[PDB]
A paper describes a structure:
β-Lactam antibacterials, that is, penicillins, carbapenems, monobactams, and cephalosporins, target the penicillin-binding protein (PBP) family of transpeptidases. In Gram-negative bacteria, inhibition of high-molecular mass (HMM) class A and class B PBPs (PBP1a/b, PBP2, and PBP3) is typically lethal.
The observed binding mode depends on the nature of the boron compound, with vaborbactam reacting monocovalently, benzoxaboroles (3–15) reacting dicovalently, and phenyl boronates (1 and 2) reacting tricovalently. Structures of boronates 1 and 2 with PaPBP3 show the boron atom is sp3-hybridized and tricovalently bonded to Ser294 (the catalytic serine), Ser349 (from the conserved SxN motif), and Lys484 (in the KS(T)G motif). The direct hydrogen-bonds to Gly534 and Gly535 are unusual for PBP3 inhibitors that occupy the carboxylic acid binding pocket, that is, the pocket binding the C-3 penicillin carboxylate.
Residue numbers in the entry: 57 to 191, 212 to 493, 501 to 561
């Protein structure tokens, strides 16, 4: 068994993220080692093993012709042991992974097990590509991720800082190229150092962006509005009366977060994030039109990325949608999603209504993608989301230094097989979008409206650095 050199994983610009490092494994023929017992204590010490524990192992395995003494010493230490020239003691050249960016890209890249086989992340998803063929040994193949390590560092730092400053324990941030479907960053907190998994807590190893399923709440109101503007029955200057901030449908009451409104135009329904206003539109156009937009932008659908235990969530269908179910779909409690799905959906909206498949590998030839929302409707909804960020009473903390930005805040409700998440989903620049981003901050109470307050500022700082690192021309003009 002659171990193969595992393929290099790089970022999209060739920066190393996972590198095969030479190590030396030692195995022994007991019966041959048995001829040199006065050497055993100097061998044991050079192995970092206990004199008597080492001797027992040789004696107790006297019946075997093969045992491992030690796996993955450094090549130096390996030479040190071999230079003792003890009978029965053979070396295998192995490879161990080094992760130059460590905790910063831990969940995306993942790690290898004792046998140098992928256990998590890309290491597992592309295991065959990376592994090559043991011996003639064929070396594994190089893989360039979609991840831009510069954006990844910025995302990791700003999400970590925001969580520490606001007492929060956990969260995620996804950045996508809306044109290419490329995941430019995916960071989760807490994180772990894949180069040192000794103390590693299972909590730190959760790939939240792909695994945590939640009712996305107000962040899907834009998809309800997209269905409205595609129906033929609604234009932006149309008015809905949402007074007095509540709507009774049989036994159920729809309640608005802000109840200071009567007439709202469709932009105002998104700025105020009125559940009554989006519900009244939903009753008029029918739940099926909304369900169809949400399905077409990938909400509650397989991502196709091959991450182990990535979740699909759920977009329930009905033959008949009663009023309560229609309303709860329209304002985001009738489905459950992951942060990756939500970012993919915002990417479609930002890309003038064209969905492009998700990729965690560098995209050279962009797929054709699917026109899921008309360019006219996508353009209209982009302008409405720019007002959500820019207009009076809007999400001003999402405003991006030097650019126009667009998006929607929300309170998500955790789904498990409750607890809450503070969301901000958006894209920039607002008039010619390039990047879509979702920030998820885990929260114990529902109140506070922490989407606008803690997630939005992370969006502001990360979107600003991302656009500049990508040389996107500022659209805040002199």
């Amino acid at each position: 068994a002659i171990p193969a050199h595992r393929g290099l994983i790089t970022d999209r610009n060739g920066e190393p993220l996972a590198v095969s490092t030479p190590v030396t494994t030692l195995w022994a023929n007991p019966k041959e080692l048995m001829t040199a017992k006065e050497r055993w204590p100097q061998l044991a010490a050079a192995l970092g093993q206990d004199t008597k524990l080492f001797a027992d192992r040789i004696e107790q395995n006297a019946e075997r012709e093969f045992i491992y003494l030690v796996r993955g010493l450094t090549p130096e230490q390996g030479e040190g042991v071999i230079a003792l020239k003890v009978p029965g003691v053979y070396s295998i050249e192995e490879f161990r992974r080094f992760y130059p960016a460590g905790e910063v890209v831990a969940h995306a890249v993942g790690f290898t097990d004792v046998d140098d086989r992928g256990r998590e992340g890309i290491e597992l998803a592309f295991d065959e590509w990376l592994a090559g063929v043991p011996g003639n040994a064929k070396p594994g193949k190089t893989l360039a991720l979609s991840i831009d390590l510069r954006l990844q560092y910025l995302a990791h730092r700003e999400l970590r800082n925001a969580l520490l400053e606001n007492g929060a324990k956990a969260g995620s941030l996804v950045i996508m190229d809306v044109k290419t479907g490329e995941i430019l960053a995916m960071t989760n907190q807490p994180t772990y150092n894949p180069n040192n998994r000794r103390n590693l807590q299972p909590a730190a190893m959760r790939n939240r962006a792909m695994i945590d399923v939640f009712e996305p709440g107000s962040t899907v109101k834009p998809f309800s509005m997209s269905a409205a503007l595609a129906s033929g029955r609604w234009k932006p200057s149309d008015i809905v009366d949402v007074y007095p901030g509540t709507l009774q449908i049989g036994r159920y009451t729809i309640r608005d977060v802000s109840r200071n409104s009567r007439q709202l135009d469709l932009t105002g329904i998104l700025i105020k994030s009125s559940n009554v206003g989006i519900s009244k539109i939903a009753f008029d156009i029918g739940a099926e039109s909304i369900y169809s937009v949400m399905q077409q932008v990938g909400l509650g659908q397989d991502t196709g990325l091959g991450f182990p235990g990535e979740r699909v969530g759920n977009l329930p269908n009905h033959r008949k949608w009663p009023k309560a179910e229609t309303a709860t779909l329209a304002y985001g409690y009738g489905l459950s999603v992951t942060a990756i799905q939500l970012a993919h959906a915002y990417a479609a909206l930002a890309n003038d209504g064209k969905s492009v498949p998700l990729s965690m590998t560098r995209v050279d030839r962009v797929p054709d993608g699917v026109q899921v929302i008309s360019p006219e409707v996508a353009s209209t909804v982009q302008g409405m989301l720019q007002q959500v960020v820019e207009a009076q009473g809007g999400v001003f903390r999402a405003q991006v230094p030097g650019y126009h930005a667009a998006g929607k805040s929300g309170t998500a409700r955790k789904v498990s097989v409750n607890a809450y998440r503070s969301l901000f989903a958006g894209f920039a620049p607002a008039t010619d979008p390039r990047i879509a981003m979702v920030v998820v901050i885990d929260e114990p109470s529902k109140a506070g409206y922490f989407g606008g307050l803690v997630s939005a500022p992370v969006f502001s700082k990360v979107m600003a650095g991302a656009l500049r690192l990508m040389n996107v021309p500022p659209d805040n003009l002199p």
